[model samples]
Every structure is written in C-alpha cells, then in structure tokens.
Target: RTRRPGEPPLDLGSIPWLGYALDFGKDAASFLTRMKEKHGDIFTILVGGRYVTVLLDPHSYDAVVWEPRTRLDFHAYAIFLMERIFDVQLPHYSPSDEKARMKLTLLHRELQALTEAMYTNLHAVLLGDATEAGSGWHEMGLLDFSYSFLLRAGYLTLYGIEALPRTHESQAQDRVHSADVFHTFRQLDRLLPKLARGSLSVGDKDHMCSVKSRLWKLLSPARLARRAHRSKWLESYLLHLEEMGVSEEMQARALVLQLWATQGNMGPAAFWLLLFLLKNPEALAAVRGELESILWQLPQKVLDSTPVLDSVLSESLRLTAAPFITREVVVDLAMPMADGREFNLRRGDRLLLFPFLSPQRDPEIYTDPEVFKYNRFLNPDGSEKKDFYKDGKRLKNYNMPWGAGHNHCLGRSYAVNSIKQFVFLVLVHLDLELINADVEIPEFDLSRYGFGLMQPEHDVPVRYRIRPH
Candidate 1:
C-alpha cells in the first residue's frame, strides 16, 4: 500500500517486494543513522515486507517500549523472527501469558545458584585438581578462547552431565560425555546465523537436526528428572515442556534457543570486557583495586561492591552491543516523538528500537561518547549512576543494551553475572596481555549485529599466564 498523500515519504531506497532489504543488509546501523539524520527522530523505512517505524530519540523510545502489547505486539515480532529464521515455533508463550511470566520468575530466582555454579565451573576450568595445572604463557585467538574455553565452561555450568546422575554415575564420565555434546553445541552455534536468515543448505539442515536430536536425547525425561535439581530455570522449563506435550523436535529447538541465549552474547561480551581491560591498564588497576578492597568478601558480595567493574561492564556493553529491539504494530496508532511531532503508524507495520548506538553514543548525552571511559557510568561517590540525560534533562531507562519493558532480554541477570564472574576470575587467576602489545582493538563486525555482541572482524591474539600469589 502507498503512503497517504499527507504521510511521510519513503525515507530510504525501497523496492516492491524487497523494500529496504539491500540497504539494511549492507549496514543496518549506518543506514538507520542516515535515515534518522535526514528524517529526524521518527521515520519509516521498509524492511522486507513491512514498513518499520523507527524511534531514535530516548524519550520517543519510551513510547515504543511502553505501548500496550494489544497495540504494539513485541512478542509477535519475535515469534515471526524465530519461526522464519530458526524454523521453530513458539505459539503459546507470549509476554502476556501468566504461565510464561512464571518461567521468567523462575529464571530470576535461580540467578544466585547459576552464579555459584558458574564460579565453581570456571574455577575448575582454570585450575582445579581434576584439571591440568597451568604454568606458562598460552597463545590463542580471542574468539577461539571465548568459544572453546569460556563457552564450554558456561555450558558445563549450565547443563553439564554431572547434573544428570540418572545416566552418568561418575563425574569423570559426565565430563567426557558432556564434552562430546558441547562439541555438538558448537556446531549448532556456528550454523545459527544462517538458520536465522532462512538460508540453510541440505547439509546444514542435516547437521543442525543431528545436533538437535543429540540434545533431545540428552534432555530425555529420565535425565531431566535428575537434572531438575541442577538449575531452577531448567527444572521449570522441562516441566513446562512436558506439560505442554512439546515434541522432542521442539524441545530440541528450545534447547538450541537456550544454548544461544546463554552463550552467544556472553562469549563476545566477555572477550570485549577483557580486551578493554588489557588495553587500558589504568582501568584494569582501578577494577583490581576495587576487587582487592573486597578480597575477604563472598564472590557475589565482591561483584556487588565493585562499582568500577560494573561501569566497565556497562561501557563495554554500550560500545559493543548492536541490538535493534523490534516490535510489530497490531493496531493503527500515532506515536509522539521527542519534539512533539506525531508519526502515524498502521497495523501490520513494524517498530525498530535501535539502541546499539544512538543514546549510548550521542555526544549530547555522554562526554566524548566515542572514547572508552571505564568510569563513564559511575558517580564520584562510586555508585552505579542511573541518571543519564539527553537534551539537558535527566532520563530514565536511558541505557538499553538489554532492551526495555515487556520485551527485555529474559536472561539479562544471568548474562551479567556470567560476564562479571568470568572477568573477575580472569583477573584473579591469570595475567592477560595482547600478543602484539601495539595491537588495536578489533573493529565491530556489523554483520553480526542483531545476533548479539558485534563480533570482531578478526580475532586478536592474546596470551595468558597463571598468576602466582
């Protein structure tokens, strides 16, 4: 349908079926920025078969996030992506469902347990009696380190076979079998982007299905019964799966989603967090000072006390995350922009909230927005500063790396806890350095934007040595 005579004109290159497909595929953030600059904070760009109304300003973003789902259906858009991209269907779980909400509560309640498990698993991976003791400097690609070591440790923390005693009698057997399954998880992880784009070859489909089937078998009823004690999130999810009579295939797909959700962002985010610390020695020293102050405290308490670490994490997320939280307008409506102008939106139209840059990077909001200031998020008194502003006014919900409102990332707490614990553990146990001390921070490969932390175009070589007390 053509825009009405008084409506906004096409803000970007649009074709009949493709719309702004080429432009968006080329570079979503730049394309959006160009459009916003030309058309102001509010405009429409055709994305695929839908007219996506973009809200760029933080205040206008509130309207987008807070709009009742009855009008702007966020989960509907998510389901469309999941179904189209992953070939999985989540028909019953909507943001409004009380049953679905209960799962999120369970996930939240289990964060403490998850944190503890992660700490133990990470410690074991680094240096427990069962693991080989490290002595000398080791060199590896940053992504390889993240995926092979950090992600594997995370997998063990979350879903190791030790949690399933019904099948495995000994922890050693559990670790061996789990290692094999972890390898399979990597295979699926690598194929996910292609699966999301609905561009899978026959071989790709076979590989994915084989991996999913392995997961399905591993998460069988007998195993799930014993595994229920491992993590509340898994226990609740397994019960829900059985109650819903979800097929093994769907369960497999669900686990794949969970696997990606837990590991995808954390891997790259952890890499960036460490990369920043390695690059900025002063910032590293500040965080170490904060940690040393709480040396006698419990691990969680140490995390709670380290405001500098929190700020560094926040800054890292701000710079590296490339999220475009999207929703679909289910009803015809008019959205008010920051400047008091209204943009008319129609049913079946889409809403894109691109938080990766804009507010976080806007020079009006942060001093020297492009530079990595580890303390940018901290107040002088060392509290995590929540009050950030644009246009000389204090703003709420200003930082949206985890998104906002009903559509926010469900596993945010777990993700943060994992990243913090990983960083803390690295700081405590290892000495980190760039193999090339003059190596620059890797560029954000925008190709991997919406998926999670924008992966580096190429991995930086890093060396790590066990720190002696």
Candidate 2:
C-alpha cells in the first residue's frame, strides 16, 4: 500500500521468470539493493511476470501493512510461497482483514501457554549436564553446540515429554532438522523453489524423504499410544482434538512447525549476540554488570528481574534479525505515504517488509545505532517494553525478530526466555571475548537466503573460559 512518488517508472523488461529468480537465488539482499538503487525504495520488479513492489522507505511501510490492499495480494502470492517451502500446515493465517482480527485472539493464547511452559524449565534444558560434563564449560564449535542445545530446548518446551518418548526424541529432532537441511548452500531463495522436486541441490533429497517417513511413523497408532500414555497434557489435548475429529497428522504437523520456529531463528540470534558482546567491550562490560545484578538474586528472582538481559537480547536481535519475511497482499488496497504518493496493490502481490534492516540501523530512533546499548527497552518508569512500528504504525518491536500481525510468531516469548537464560548461565561461570577485536559484522549473504537462517552477514566467533568461582 506504500504509494511510490510520481517519478517516471522504469521499464521492467519481460525477461525469463527464472532469470529474475536466478538473481534472487544468488543474492536476495543484493538484489534488493540493486532494485532499490535502480527503482528507488518503491520500484517494481518483473518477477515471474508480475510487477512486485519492494517498499524500502519507512514512510510508506504502513500502507503495505495497515491500509486496504488494492494493488497487491500480499499473502496468496508471497507468504504462501514461503509457507509451502517451510511446510507450515497451520490455517491460512494471513493479515487479510478478517483473518488478522480473528486469528490474533487464538494465537495469543497459544503463545502465552508456550511462553509459560518454556520459561518454567528453560535453564535446565539449555545448560544440559554441563556440571557433570566438565569443569567450567567446554569450548565447542557452532555445529556441535547448536544441534543439541537447540534440539533439547525445542523438545523441553514445545511438547509434552511423551511426544518425545525416550527413543523417539532423537528421530524427531533429526526429522525436524531435515526440514531445512537440504539447502545448506545458504541459498534458501534458490533452494526453496526447488523443494517442489522433492529435493534440494544437496544429496539431502534422500535424507529429506527419510525424515518425512519417520515423522509419519511417529504418528502411527503404536507410537501415538506411547506418547499419549506418557504425558497428561498431550493426552488431554490430543484426545479432545481427536474427539472433535482433528486428524493425528494435524498434531504431528504442529510439532514440526514448532521445531522450525524454535531452532530456525536461534542459531543466528546466538551467533550475533556473542559477536556483539565480543566486539563492543563497553557493551559487554555493561552486560556483565547486568548479569551480576541478576546473579546475586535467587534463580526465580533473577529470572523475574531481567530487564537488562531482555534489552541486550532485544538489541542483539535487532542487529542480527532472523530473516526478513515477505507477505502477499491478499486483497487490493491503497494508502498514503510520507512521499505523498500512492500505488494500487492487487490481490496476490508480494510485499517484502519483514526485516528490521533500516529500522534497526535508523539513527533517529536509536542513539549510537552501531554501538551496542545495554538497556534500550527501559522507559523512564523502568519497565522493559518497546514501542515497535512497521509502515509507520505503532506496535511492539524488539519482540518481533519472530514477526508481527496475524501470523506473528507463536514462539517469540519462549525464544526470548531461552536466549536470556542461556546468556545468564554463560555469564555466570564463563568469560567471553571476540576472536578478532575489530572485525566487522558480516552482512547477510542474500545469496544464501535463509541459508544460515539468522540475518547476520557472517559468523563472529568468540573464545570462552570458565571463571573461578
């Protein structure tokens, strides 16, 4: 709905759909940059025969978000494509006027329940058997750490323990990982479209097929019985849904989605936070100061009084962002813009607006944007809250690395708690430092769109040592 200024439109030639797509696959972020440079913040790209508008300036952002959609169909075309690739089976939960208003109520309850459950047992899962495993903590690689740390965290929080009966946990976790393993070239934009072939570029095609097979096996009568007997909550929920005729596959599918949501954003977030702490000594010092403030309290009390921790997590998220999501405009709509121009949006038009790229880096909104700040979320009153906006309308931010609107991530609260708890534990007995003091944060390689998942440009490694208690 962002109205482009009345500058003369560029001729978007009719090139092969795959040709434009090839550029998208190779480097999506750069493609965006190129498109923005040549077309301004609001030029149209000739994508697969459609003139898709990419709105860059914040002024017109809301038109795509809040105003009536006239020219672009945001969901049917944009989000549906991604959802298909991610295999999200939830209902068509787009921001269509009706869907947005209706789904939020149910989504809120679902998210709140998830948050409370995850917070209750967060530390135990993330810390693992570290005390038994070694002195201080072991220095490990990203691949090794993320696989188990996030998998355990996902299992502990997302399901009733029964769904992951002793022997099945490993299988389910592996299958969940397979959902995206095929496209490790870090080129999600390229790989996602290829999923229709029942494979990606890698030989993971067989692995992906195997993963799905095992996932279905877990839902068979034999396994479902084992799961239902193991947990009271799963029993009640699954039983009730079953009485209502919900297929067992629905239950299985939901679990798969949770896995994607949990680990999907975590690796990148942790990577960025560690990198920021390493690069900004002052910020790291402040975080250490913040950790000290919390550690002095009892465990419950520390968790309760964590504004500084929350702010650090939020700011780090802003810098690294997961992936900028795109939504398809479901209905034709229009809106006014800061540039005093308006463009019609047609049904099914994809609008790219999920990333916090410019906003996170915006100079006016943030003081010392590049420098890490410890507690930006605290208001004068001292509560850790943020007023986020998209397309210029006020809404929650910081909490949005997951997303916002009708399909805003259902797992954000849990994700936030996990990161905070992990950081607290790391700070409690370990010292963290950057590998190369002044190395720049990597720009996310759009070529590897969704490849590494986290929106960071590169991995920033740090060395960790245990502190003498």
Candidate 3:
C-alpha cells in the first residue's frame, strides 16, 4: 500500500484480513510505536477484516473523540462487540435513554444511600466474623483478595442483597450468595479477550460459555425480585429490558454487561493503588496521614479533592489505565489533526485511540514514563499539578484514564469515591504487606491491554491482619 496526499498511509500486511493481528493483539502499545515510526503518527492497517486507522498523537485525538456520532459512531462498534464477545443483541440502542437516566440516578441524587450501602455491604463481606478479626495473619493472592472483595461488594450495591430479615443470619446469606456470583463472573471475564479474537477452541469456549450462562442464571430477574435496595440503574435497566420486549435470554445476558459496567474496573484500580502505595513508603505514609486527618469528618465522596491520595491515585492510573477510545467512520471524511494536517478517513472503517500509548507513556509528556512516582502529579504548593506539555505544546487532555468522549464514565465521581473508600478502608483496617519483602511488580497480562484496567500477569502473594485494634 502506498501513501497518497491527504490519505493515511496504508499497511496491508502479507496476510489478508488477519495481517498484524498477532503483533497488534499481543502488545498494542509496542506495536503502535513501530507503526508510528514507520508510517508516522496516523496510519491505516488491516486488522481482522477492518482497516483500523489508529491516531497515535494526543493533540490529534479530538477530531475522533468528540466527532459527531453520525459521522463517527461509537454505538455501532459497541453493538458489534456485544454480539461478538457476549451473546447479547439489542436491535435498538439509546445512549441518552440509559446513560442520562443512569447519570441522574447515581450522579448524586442518592449518594448518601449509595455510600451507606457500600459501607454496610463491605462490612459484611470484608470484615466478617469479628471474633476471627485478629486471628494472626491471613494470606492470599492480592489479585483474588482485591477482586473477590470488590466484585462482591459492588455486586451487592447494584444487584441487591438476599431477601431476608436484616439480621446476623440474613447478612451472612449475602456473603455466601455474592461470592458465588463472583466465582462465575471471574471466569466469564477471563474468557473475553480470547472470545473477542475468535481464538478460543471449542472445548475452552464451551466451558467459558457455560461460565457465562451460569452467571446469568445466578442473576435472573426472579432472584432480583427477592432482594432489596437494587440500584435505580439496575431497576430501570430491567424496567427497560422488559418494556422493550427483549427476549428472556437477552435479559439475563444483558444484565451480565450491566454488572460489568458498574463493577469491573474499581477492583483492579484498588490493586494498583494499593500496590503502588505499599512499594513507596513515603506515599503510603503521606496518603494515610491525609486519610486519617479528614476521612472521619466527612463522607468519602468529599475526599475526591484530597491532594496526596488524589496525586497517588492519578499517578497510578496514568501508568496502568487502558481505556481504548474507539469509533466507526460512518462516512468519508477528512480529519483535521492538531498540527494542522488533514488525513482523509474513508467510511466504514475503524478509527481507534489508545491514550495509554500516546500522551500517557510518551517520554516527552512525562519523564521516565514507565516509572511510577506517586508525587509526579503533585505541586510543591500542596495542590494537584495540571500543567504538562509535549515539546512546546501544552496539553489539555494530558491524562485520559476514564475520559473518552461519548464513553466518558457516567458515574465517574461515584466510581472514584468507591475506589478511594476501598483504599482507605483496606489500608486502615488491614495490616497488609507483600509476602516476599521485595516482590517484583508483575507484568500486565497482555490479554487485558486495552480494557479499562489491565490485570497483572499473575497474582502477588500478600499477607493481611485485622490491624490489632
């Protein structure tokens, strides 16, 4: 393929549709660097029957991210992924209808209730059986510890607890039920990358398909009716799920995504924040000091502006967040990039952005990009730092962990508060340490590169005690 004036250079690999799939799929960040080197910042390549034109310049992203949905649509690709990865289909989709209602619901109308429910559920799941609280040290893989606790806690918040008396026994039931849901849910998530790539063999896919359906069974509408305090998010999703006359199978499967939407990323974020803090004693001490000084006086959501913890969290996410801003070019168009160059983007092809590879890890924007300095985002004046640049160009979207245009998280405040609360609680309540004093931080599991939060290649062993109070 040759470059043409105003058209992005094309790299039609030796293989047809599957060209560059292996290298691209295995390590998107590294492959994109070479692609940028060879073809410059923006280039089109054959990616699994799609001519994916990847825009790798941070300043050049607005033309795609904020472009009108009619010309560059996110909904169409979103729907395609539903069918390909999960057995979900909605002939009609409305972002406004669901997200608007969801934003209104979770975006502070009832923060108190949401906050309290999270606290109560966490008490039940995380600090259960007070008698065993100080029973020496408990050891587990930090991945399992963080995820198992987080998924169960968030699941109960959105999905409702078991229908029973609010007694000791009733609360115990929630612990049992939600853990079972996570058991199935984890396996389902484990299957996503392979399922998306069509790389799963019949036998592995069969097992994971069963794992997927088992979760749907566990979350059936009937079970929801028996419980209380289901988030309005869930209530209306089910309300709309039926009002729209979707099939029964789709309802259960649809709910799987609903759970994923609300519950997925915070757990891994906690793992990152926790591990990052533990490895840096000064950051851990500073954050704990910040948390202890003010956390008791106000609710967790208000801690959104706290400086040290905020800086710590920002730096951690900068390193590991993997939000892929994606769009489908619905019509022929010329994209006006930041540096005043125009690239003709053809219709019916995919336009993609992985901010992590671009501004996020670019050495020009952040020195020693791969190294995590917990204070990298802090100013000496005790305020959060916001000024950053690439060459002489000051960046407005210098950091975009969860800030994609249309797919911008509807409940970002809600999600951040949740992560802050989790980190606050774990550090304060549990005496936690890496099992090996100088354990190496594991590599990212490549399968999860462009997903919300990348998973570690393997779990790190950790020890925790119920901080002898």
Candidate 4:
C-alpha cells in the first residue's frame, strides 16, 4: 500500500517483516521519527510481510479507532507475541463485535464492583505499611520497591481478607520476590525479533515453554491454605470458574496467563510513576498537598479520599505510558488523515496506538506537555473529567493507556486502583527524590523491544526518607 509512484516498492530489505524491526529495535522513537521525516504524516513498514502505516493525524486516528467492522485488531499481535515469548495463550482477547460488547458489559458489571471493594481494603493496608516503610526506609532497589509495596498492595487487594490463610501458607512471596518479572518480560520480548530471523533454536523455544510452566506452578493454589482456612477471593474465583465448567488445572493455566498479562506492565508503570514524581519536586509537592487535603477531611485514616493522588497518578500515566497500545490490521483499509491525504493500509499489518504520547502531548488538550502538570487531569473545581471512564463506557479514543475495543485491559480498574494506592502511600508519608534531581531524564527506549510498551534500558533509582513528623 505504501509503494509510491516512482519509488522502489517498500518491501522489508532482508528480514521478511523487518527492515524496520532492526531499526525499531535499535531506536523506536528514531524509527517513528525517520518515517515521519521521510513521509510526513504517514509512512509504511513491512512487518512480517504485512504493510503497516504510521499515521500522524488526529482524524486518521479517529478513522482507525472509530470505524465499525474495520477488521483491525489489537490482540492479534498480543496473541502471537505472548505465545512466542511466554508460551501462554491469551484466550479470545480480540476485537470482534461480539467480543467488544461482552468486554464493555464485563467492565461495568464485574470490574467496577470489584474495584470499589478493593480500594476500601487497600487504603487501610497501605497506610499502615507505608508509614512503617517510610519511617525505617533506606536506599532500595527498584525491584524491591516493586515487591514490598506495589506487588503486596495489589495482591492483598485482589485476594481480600479471606486470603490471609493463603498468604500465610504460601511460599510464592519468597520464591519470585527477587525475580523481577519486569526483566523476565523484557528478556522474553527479545524473542519476537529473534523469531523474525531464521535463528530461533529449540532451546529458545523451550525456554518460553519452561517460563509458562513455572509461572503457573508459582500461581498454583496451595492445598495447605484450603486445609487451614478454606480460602479467599482468588481461591473462590477459581471455584466459581469451576462451577462455570473450567477445570482446576485449566484454572491454574488461566491464572498463569492472567498474572503475567496483568502485572507485566504494571510493575514497571509503578516504577516510572514514582521515578517521575521523585524527579519533579513541584509535582510531588502538589500531589502531597492533595493527599493532605484528602486526609484532612477524612474522619479516619482513609485511603479512598485521595483525589489529588488520583490526579497525579493519572498525569503520570499520561506522561509516561508504560505500554504502547498495539493493534493489527485484519482487512485492507484506507484512512483520511488530518491533513486531507488518504493512506491505504492492508490486512495483517500492525499499528502502535500511542495514546500516552499523542494525547498527553497534544497542546490543545494538555497545556505544557513537557512539564509535569499534576492537575491537568483535574478540572478547576477539582472534579475529574468525564472523558476518564474507568469501565470503558466512554469513547475509545481518549486516555487509552490501558487500550480499548474488545481487547481492552481486563484488569484495567484493578491496575489503576493498585497504582493509585501505591502512589498515595508514597506521597502521604515520604520525602522521596531521584538520586540526582537536576539531571536530564532520558527518553524512554523501545528499540528491539516487543512493541513500545516496556521500560528504558537505564534503571532509575530514587531515595526516600520520612518527612519530619
């Protein structure tokens, strides 16, 4: 579709899908920049023999996003990519009309009610844990921060009080605490590029298979927990899935798949949000002020009242999207660009819907995109914008950090609420800062990466201390 009138047909030079894959692996932003430089708003890349166009116009975005029966899907790549890297299947995560309708209903009816209950318990646990951590805090690894606060916070909320027996009887907290799953996802992500070349080994294939097998075992339900205290939300959910005719082993398998899916990007997103907050002093102060006010009005030490904390969390997501929204073209299509030009796309082509980059960077919507404006997500009277829909009822176009359509993040509310709680704890009690606040924060790196969703190559470490009581 991108073969120009007089230019050579835009075929992948040597690699079947990637003259740009190597280029993309080396520098993701550069690949996009180079394409934009050469072709203005739209340029084509041969991805696995499919022709993908990079669109720069807002209207083009609308056409691609808003179209009905367009035959484009986000989960196509997720399915293939996950199978190759993690050896786990993403069951029916797709963009079909029926799937989309089911996803919307699930978001509202299932995820919303689960989220409200989650935050209620989460607020109590974080306040106690963060105060203890902040009081005795020292220099720590980014991964440790992930486990101690973020992972514990999320697991506790999801598992509920009924999970006390499970946590007490389980050793999973010990086994994988040091195994930064963030790095696992990154290391495994390298397979996409390796598979593109004819260089994949049998051993390489088995490594992923081993990963899925091991991860599911790690997520296995402990019989000891059932013997001791019967169980909790997760254990009960497995039983409910059983009532729905899902087998225990299959439930275990789904647990492996969902655990990786939910937490793969979340751990890193927490790291980035905290890193940015530590780096930006003013933003941190504003967030702290919001936390103070929220706490000030609360009768008890409530975690549910932190609106400023929510705004900062939203702003961080806008500024540093942990994962890029990835989609695939299932049919040949043409899009009308914002600049009045038409670009034809083809089936099997892939697209990166960078809602984090485009929407947050838009001058019209977000003022001073470069600066950390904490309240940009909040209206003047301190209410959140209606466009920020939690359960996918709003339009698919805005704030797609968790993506939309049928393949919208199943754990979207869970992830956001978990992040919100972690940030609230940090802001309320700690004086955390980057190792060097004045240094330039580097651009997020995405070359050779699966898509543009993972973190940069360099590790960002921040130091924290208790604010004077």
lDDT of 2 by residue, 1-469 (tens): 2334442244354465533655655666667666666766565566555556566665445445543334434355334433564453444344354233323533546545655555433444443345435555355543334444544554544444343333445444433443233223123323333574344746656555556545545433345464322223344445544565646666564444334444566645766676667667777777778778766642654455666667777788766563554556666555455667766555665666535544665554566766666567767676866775545566334334655443355445556656665666666756555555786777664544532244443445555555656
Rate residue 214 of model 3 by lDDT: 88
Q: Candidates 1 and 3: which is better by lDDT?
A: 3
Task: Pull out the clashing pairs in model 1.
Answer: none
Question: Can you write out model 1's per-residue Cα lDDT over 396-432, one digit (the tens) per residue?
Answer: 7667788787766767777787777777777776777
TM-score of 1: 0.89
Residues 306-369, candidate 4, lDDT per residue (tens digit)?
A: 6666777666666666345555776766656555566566566676555544554555455677
Model 2 alpha-carbon drift over 4 Å, by segment:
1-14, 67-83, 86-120, 142-147, 162-199, 215-251, 297-304, 329-333, 362-400, 429-445, 448-468
Descending-TM-score candidate ranking: 3, 1, 4, 2
Off by over 4 Å in 3: 129-134, 163-165, 295-305
Evaluation by TM-score, superior candidate among 1 and 2? 1
Candidate 3: give the clashing pairs: none
Candidate RMSDs in Å, in order, are: 3.1, 6.2, 2.1, 6.0
How do the candidates rank by lDDT, highest first?
3, 1, 4, 2
Please give, for residues 352-379, the per-residue lDDT of candidate 3 as tens digits.
8889988889888998999889889988
Candidate 4 ranges with C-alpha deviation above 4 Å? 1-17, 66-70, 89-135, 159-211, 221-250, 298-307, 322-327, 337-341, 362-368, 378-398, 439-445, 448-453, 465-469
